[PDB]
Ligand binder design. Structure first.
Ligand code: ERJ
Ligand code: ERJ
Ligand code: ERJ
Ligand code: ERJ
Ligand code: NA
Ligand code: NA
Lengths: 337, 337
């Protein structure tokens, strides 16, 4: 009754655009411990052959995961990445949860990227990633996306074809789009200069604490050097929670939702980021948004695959209330409706 | 009219029954050296994430590989192993090459086994094997196979479901079938008692030199102890060739066919065994048979996948002539054509 129809519709098009990998995750379980059974002698002429007792294929890719979670939580999200012609079923899966997939580049030749991962009983991982169609993400122009769906409220620059990451970030700077620097695995692979090129001007920087130290080491930046380039640092601390740090040093710390199981750590970070950014878009403060992100992250930790979790108001509210109090759980549920 | 009809026909029989794994091989290439970047410090908290720049899916499994090679070379072969309902195209692939697949067990529920392997530029490997339908190989009775195709000249007991390996070997002993003990990868996993149970009474023992030392260590056997249990030992020595050793110590040594490239070592041993045993079934002597096996082995070494090589009498003859002399090449081609 009190909504301005014109202005509400005007803003409805301001989506989150998620750029990053789109993949199939081929996940296997090793019924042992890599750290214990592997010995230093096995690394000098490497020949490893693990017997695995489980194998499942699931939808994945950092951008696929984040878009799935934003869509499931009710946000407005567009998936912007490269995949192969095999993508049809994945497309239907994402569209059924509200994800705009019109601007997924479909390669004429290459298959969708593949993440192959063997996880042991202690959640340690030995994995390989095949880019396939992901390399063609460097041919996506965010200008065309904007022309089609309008200026997004935020562009997430997740792990992707590296050249696509640099081009997307620079196009955000040029078009005045707010972006979240979420380089994740590429922090292990890029040079300090390249990383600096991904961070400058970011509305958000997302890393975990290890990745934060890695970024500082490789870039040669101090923390103050980074905070001069970004509006907010979000650093996940695993079971120790998450820090949200403004440029003036103001820090908000949020604890985690305790897990009922540690099934598979794949996609936990993606899910935290998706939940946090959905909460922020929905009007929640930094602390409440991080609390939502922590819930989604633990739901991914407790399931095999990255998009196999389920959203249930009653269970979500109960776990949020247990971790953060009934008032916080109520505010979170109130914005998600 | 100088042929002895009885003995001619007596020698004419050459059916080989191949037991062992049937699989799809998911092969990837790491464009670097594991040795350059994997260090003992990475064992504390194991978390490896390789970028691979090639991914292909190929027909595989040790029994599939050996049956393919025997069929391609003109031998008489039946494939005896467990697969999944996905096996249909694989079946057509093998039948088109003369392989009898009537006695492949098709699981009602499980997928064909899967070998996932990353190989670096120095041929080092990191791999995982998911048995799936392979476990159901323990339900295959060689008595039914014999009832269908008659008493084979040889049963190859290759890497398989371990219980199936034991059941097949004991059924060969009870039914009086000559068998080749080819446990290969299972030598890394079985106990000395189990290995001894696989070797006793073998017509052939096939291993590489490392596997030979491993067998001797785990079984507690000396070489003479082994030679008292088997009719012929075949020990491959990689670039140093192959030793063929009778119980009385009589040794035939054969050098290798020089390779034109070192592309992928997966299935090279399978191919040697198949070529050697086909040559023997066709009436070639030990040396000529090992020369044929060495050719097939290098053809697999030079190609991606285990069954992607091509059999061409003229190219084969030229390489055999270069390695072993025109007389040997001619004798081999004359028997196979
Ligand atoms: O966040 C979890 C998600 O990350 C996805 N992924 C896993 N490795 C990668 C890499 C990579 C690795 C070595 S070099 C580049 N790049 C881009 N996405 C990846 C995976 O598909 C999973 O669903
Ligand atoms: N993200 C990474 N680890 C966690 C945990 C957790 C708690 C004890 S062990 C792992 N709990 C919730 N979210 C997490
Ligand atoms: O010899 C090359 C062929 O061996 C096949 N293979 C690779 N690992 C195995 C294993 C195994 C591994 C760890 S525990 C048991 N078992 C049975 N076959 C295998 C593969 O499908 C390839 O085509
Ligand atoms: N490099 C490692 N093995 C080989 C072989 C070979 C021969 C019999 S089995 C493997 N042949 C040529 N080059 C090789
Ligand atoms: Na998970
Ligand atoms: Na090969």
């Amino acid at each position: 009754g009190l909504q301005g129809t014109e202005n509400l519709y005007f803003q409805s098009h301001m989506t989150i655009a998620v750029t990053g990998s789109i993949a199939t995750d081929h996940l296997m379980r090793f019924p042992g411990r890599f750290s214990e059974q592997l010995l230093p002698e096995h690394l000098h002429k490497v020949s490893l052959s693990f017997l695995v007792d489980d194998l499942v294929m699931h939808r994945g890719g950092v951008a696929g995961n984040m878009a799935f979670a934003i869509g499931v939580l009710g946000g407005e999200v567009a998936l912007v990445g490269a995949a192969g012609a095999d993508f049809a079923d994945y497309r239907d899966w994402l569209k059924a949860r509200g994800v705009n997939c019109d601007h997924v580049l479909i390669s004429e030749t290459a298959h969708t990227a593949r993440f192959t991962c063997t996880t042991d009983v202690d959640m340690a991982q030995i994995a390989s990633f095949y880019p396939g169609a992901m390399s063609e993400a460097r041919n996506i122009k965010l200008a065309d996306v904007v022309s089609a769906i309008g200026k997004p409220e935020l562009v997430i620059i997740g792990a992707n074809d590296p050249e696509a990451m640099f081009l997307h970030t620079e196009e955000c700077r040029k078009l005045g789009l707010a972006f979240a620097a979420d380089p994740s695995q590429q922090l292990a692979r890029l040079s300090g200069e390249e990383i600096r090129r991904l961070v400058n001007g970011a509305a958000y920087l997302f890393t975990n604490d290890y990745e934060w130290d890695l970024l500082l080491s490789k870039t040669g930046w101090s923390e103050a050097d980074v905070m001069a380039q970004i509006d907010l640092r979000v650093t996940t601390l695993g079971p120790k929670g998450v820090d949200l740090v403004e440029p003036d040093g103001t820090t908000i710390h949020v604890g985690v939702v305790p897990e009922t199981s540690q099934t598979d750590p794949t996609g936990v970070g993606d899910a935290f980021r998706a939940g946090f950014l959905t909460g922020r878009s929905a009007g929640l403060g930094l602390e409440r948004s991080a609390q939502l992100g922590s819930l989604v992250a633990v739901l991914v930790l407790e399931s095999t695959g990255t998009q196999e979790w389920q959203w249930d108001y009653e269970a979500a509210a109960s776990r949020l209330a247990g971790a953060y109090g009934e008032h916080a759980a109520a505010e979170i549920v109130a914005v998600l409706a």
